Amino acid sequence: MTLETTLFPLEGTGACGASYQLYAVKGLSGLDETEYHKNVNLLVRRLSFSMKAPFVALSRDGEQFIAVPNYVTEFPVDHRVVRAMVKLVPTGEPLNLRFDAADDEYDGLRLRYLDFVLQQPLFANHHLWQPGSGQPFFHKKPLKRLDDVDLYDGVSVRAAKHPEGGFGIVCDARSKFITHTPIGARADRKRLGKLINRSCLYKMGDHWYQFRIDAVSDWKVGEPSLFEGNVPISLAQQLVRTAGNAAPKSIIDLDPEGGALEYFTSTNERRMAPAELCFLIEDTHGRRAAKLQRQTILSPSERRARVNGFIRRYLSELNIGGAKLSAGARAHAFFTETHMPPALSFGNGTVLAPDTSKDRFQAMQEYSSMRRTMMLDKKVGFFHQDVFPPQTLLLPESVKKSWGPAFASDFVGTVQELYPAGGYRPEIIEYRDKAYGGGVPGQMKALLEVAERGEIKSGDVLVMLHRINGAPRAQDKLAAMVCNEFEKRFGKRVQVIHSDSPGRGYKRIFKNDKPTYVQQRGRGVNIKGYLKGAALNKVCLGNSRWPFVLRDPLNADVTIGIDVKNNMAVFTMVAEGGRIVRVQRSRSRQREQLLESQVTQVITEMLSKELPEIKKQVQRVVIHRDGRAWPAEIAGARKTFADMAESGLIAVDADVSVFEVLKSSPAPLRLFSFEEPTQENPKGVINPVLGSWLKLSENDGYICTTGAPLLLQGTADPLHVRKAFGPMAIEDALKDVFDLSCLTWPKPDSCMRLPLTIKLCDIA
């Protein structure tokens, strides 16, 4: 109930002049509404980096109007490229913004200005450094030495609005791994070349920054490579030219036979750095250095200590010209009523409700465990208990010839236990995984030939694939290809498993004078768990047999998720308590955005098939967009439901609200709770509990979809959701984000950060 944030009050915020003067953009009156807004921000970013000033966007009405600080002296006004050139007619009215006012429409300006000028002092700090503009500030001194690699601690800072009036700062702790020794001068041509597109920390004297390597310089540090006016000049000469006063020996005593890396700027120009002063950034998602990565995951006590310490060490005194600023000693804290998890409907009339006569922690633990136990109990079981339509299990021939048959027997028995009503009994069918393949071509030839011969009777296929790309931070092209061609060309609905994971669960043994495959409970996988999980997710959920649903209505009658990534749009729909769930794909022009007409067609077509099944008259609707939302999409959104209300399919006085779910959030905010200080927890800092929530303004809030009882380690990351339109309160919207995230179907006894609505987008 008693909760703290990482949102620190800003003090001394009088006498702060954010001086702009608007301009307007004639451009091309061909408002493509899809190309019209790409070029809006294209030029804003292009001008921000060249002029090195806080250019922002305030798109009103015509959705033009780049805002320019009045203190930039020269200005081109008319700007090139971008197809049809633009003129910048100044709308005049110089704007000298304050920070003591009420909530205004120019605030998206002030925030930008604030952010920009907060990184002037921290830039000057000899003990801190920043990988690049916008990234967090790390100490020059490593937090820890992990052998050949150093762990660096930093803090990220964004400006934000204080819910109790005024302005403040949100910050979070942050980690980074950098190899301890530099690449060095002795590394040869071939070795430097083998490092392209890697990123390194460059210690250019007292100025440290991060850049991505593009090419190996033809020239060495000592050989002339560039020009100081018109004289051939070495990289060593250049670095000596621009060093300050008490320059460190390293920048003025370079080995001249060392090589140089080449990189590009924000301004898109080519520079060199001496490899003798470059330190590779290690990717801990790569190397599966998960023993390294635990070091990156902080206890709440640790996270609060590190953030508060950074605030009191580097943000107490801060001058930007004539202004003098502070940051509150203690962060914004409050009381609140944590949301209780929703009551859930299982099979045979059974309902799960949290115990209000328990402390929230214990009640949540018992509810979450009860989701699994109730699903498994043959006396209550799945909400949706019916037999399965025909099924197919499609295996690599190499698997079918060895350990496949034992895995299949176990998998069928596991499904029949988990989901007794299904009568699971698939046809087992193989493909020639060794005949053409190895990679995606040839695996696909084998899969396609099996499907073409019509061997896959039935429409539901579970297909076992080899893992082509074993490295993490990689996409499964083969699985996507198999889903696309089996949906598109044949009628099929395809779920996927891989062969490495169950393969590690079988070993060959001699029994009864026969070679035989049997389970091994050793190392590589826990096969019983594997079986129950894949049974749940690929066969049960893959056939839309939901294990439980919400008992009570949400604030929305219908709630729709949208995600556009890879030119490949995904709509999802949840209605009734989760008893109605649809997912439809598409393709659109832009790789991360959607056309307006497409939106209004797909949503109408999708919801109309389900309105006969939606018994209660529909009168409030919510859209969850994954990431940034586009107004081209809001237009079609409002249109769809206005039309439907006119028809009468929907309530006449019905409304729509649109909310963005920012899973990686521009302003990262944490929440802490407090327990009695134990010997282990010296300040008694603990995770917030599962329903905790906070709104900042009418447009921004945070729900803990992950939190206290159910988190193994780390400090929970609150989920940011931001209003974009509509009458529904942000509080109501957060509450049914929380309820939708308790539909933890992929793993009943766990917590789950995204609401089911955008989770269904993520899996496709």
CATH code, 683: 3.30.420.10
Are 418 and 487 a contacting pair, CB within 8 Å?
A: no
By three-state DSSP, how is residue 204 classified?
strand
* Separation CA 503–CA 482 (nearest Å): 21
Q: What is the C-alpha end-to-end distance of the chain, expressed in Å?
A: 37
Find out whether 530 and 502 touch, Cβ atoms under 8 Å.
yes
391 SS3 class: strand
SS3 455: coil
What's the rounded Cα separation, in Å, for the pair 273 and 263? 8
Task: Read off the tokens for 140.
Answer: 């020059």
Displacement of CA 97 from its chain's centroid (Å): 33
DSSP class of 281: B
- Cα separation, 595 vs 589, in Å, equals 7
Distance, in Å, from the CA atom of 102 to the CA atom of 174, rounded to the nearest integer, reads 33
Q: Which two tokens stand for residue 238?
A: 């250049």
Strands, DSSP E only, in 41-133? 56-57, 66-69, 88-97, 128-129
Place of tokens 């060093």: 243
Q: Phi/psi of residue 20, each to 5°?
A: -125, 175
Strand partners, 18: 97
Of the candidates 458, 467, 465, 466, which has an alpha carbon nearest to the alpha carbon of residue 493?
A: 458
Q: Which of 728, 717, 724 is nearest to 688 (CA)?
A: 717
The backbone torsions φ and ψ at residue 733, rounded to the nearest 5 degrees and listed phi first, read -65, -40
Q: Tokens 């009215």, residue?
A: 93
CA trace torsion 20, 21, 24, 25 (10° rounding): -50
Helix (H) or strand (E) segment spanning residue 235: helix 235-241
Nearest Cα residue to 741 out of 754, 750, 726: 754
Q: Crossing angle, helix 730-741 and helix 756-763, to 10 degrees?
A: 60
Backbone φ and ψ of 467, nearest 5°: -80, 110
Kindly give, in sequence order, each residue whose CB lies less than 8 Å from that of residue 208, ignoring residues fewer than 6 positions away: 129, 140, 201, 202
Are 552 and 341 contacting, i.e. CB atoms less than 8 angstroms apart? no
- The span from the CA of 527 to the CA of 267, in Å, is 53
Look up residue 677 and give its two tokens: 């200080």
The span from the CA of 289 to the CA of 295, in Å, is 10
For residue 368, give both structure tokens: 């979450």
Phi-psi category of 344—alpha, beta or left, where left has phi over 0 and alpha has psi -120 to 50?
beta
- Cα torsion 218, 222, 224, 225: sign: positive
**Backbone region of residue 515 per phi and psi (left: phi > 0; alpha: psi in -120 to 50; beta: other values):** beta
* Residue 371 structure tokens: 């989701």
Task: Please give the angle made by the CA atoms of 478, 479 and 483, to the nearest 5 degrees.
Answer: 115
What are the distances in angstroms from CA 301 to CA 103, 672, 681? 34, 9, 7
Distance between CA 330 and CA 370 in Å, rounded? 39
Going by C-alpha positions, the residue among 4, 12, 22, 13 that lies closest to residue 111 is 13
* Partners of 519 in the β-ladder: 506
Residue 320 and residue 336 in contact, taking contact as beta carbons nearer than 8 Å: no
Q: For residue 761, report the phi and psi dihedrals to the nearest 5 degrees.
A: -65, -45
Measure the CA dihedral 138/141/142/148, to 10°. Answer: 130
Do 426 and 391 touch, CB atoms closer than 8 A? yes
Using the 8-state DSSP alphabet, how is residue 77 labeled?
Answer: -
Phi (first) and psi of residue 120, to 5 degrees: -80, -55
Query: Residues near 243 by Cβ (< 8 Å), separated by ≥ 6?
Result: 205, 251, 252
| Contact of 459 with 491, CB cutoff 8 Å | yes
Breaks (C-N over 2.5 A) in the chain follow: none
The tokens 């299982």 sit on which residue? 346
Classified as helix, coil or strand, 149 is strand
Position 110, amino acid: R
**Residue 742 near residue 710, CB atoms below 8 Å:** no
Question: What is the total residue count of the chain?
Answer: 764
The Cα 3–Cα 361 span in angstroms is: 15
Q: What is the 3-state secondary structure (H, E, C) of 300-317?
A: HHHHHHHHHHHHHHHCCC
* H or E element, residue 10: strand 7-11
Those residues with Cβ within 8 angstroms of residue 35's Cβ, 6 or more apart along the chain or in another chain: none
Nearest Cα to 341, choosing from 747, 724, 735, 619? Answer: 735
Rounded Cα–Cα distance for residues 317 and 474 (Å): 44
How far apart CA 109 and CA 356 sit, in angstroms, is 46
Residue 605's nearest CA partner among 564, 575, 571 is 571
**Sign of the dihedral through C-alpha 240, 242, 247, 248:** negative
Contacts of 407 (CB under 8 A, 6+ apart): 399, 502, 505, 506, 517
Q: How far, in Å, CA of 542 to CA of 461, rounded? A: 9
The pairing of strands 207-212 and 199-204 is: antiparallel
Q: Nearest 5°: CA angle at 111, between 11 and 10? A: 10
Q: Please say whether the beta carbons of 430 and 551 come within 8 A.
A: no
Distance CA 463, CA 441 (A): 17
Residue 759's contacts (CB-CB under 8 Å, 6 or more residues apart) are: 746, 752
Q: How was this structure determined?
A: X-ray
Closest of 126, 129, 131, 474 to residue 281, by C-alpha: 131
Domain extent, residue 585, equals: 549-763
- Cβ neighbours of 172 (radius 10 Å): 23
> Rounded to 5, what percent of the chain is helix, strand, coil?
25, 30, 45
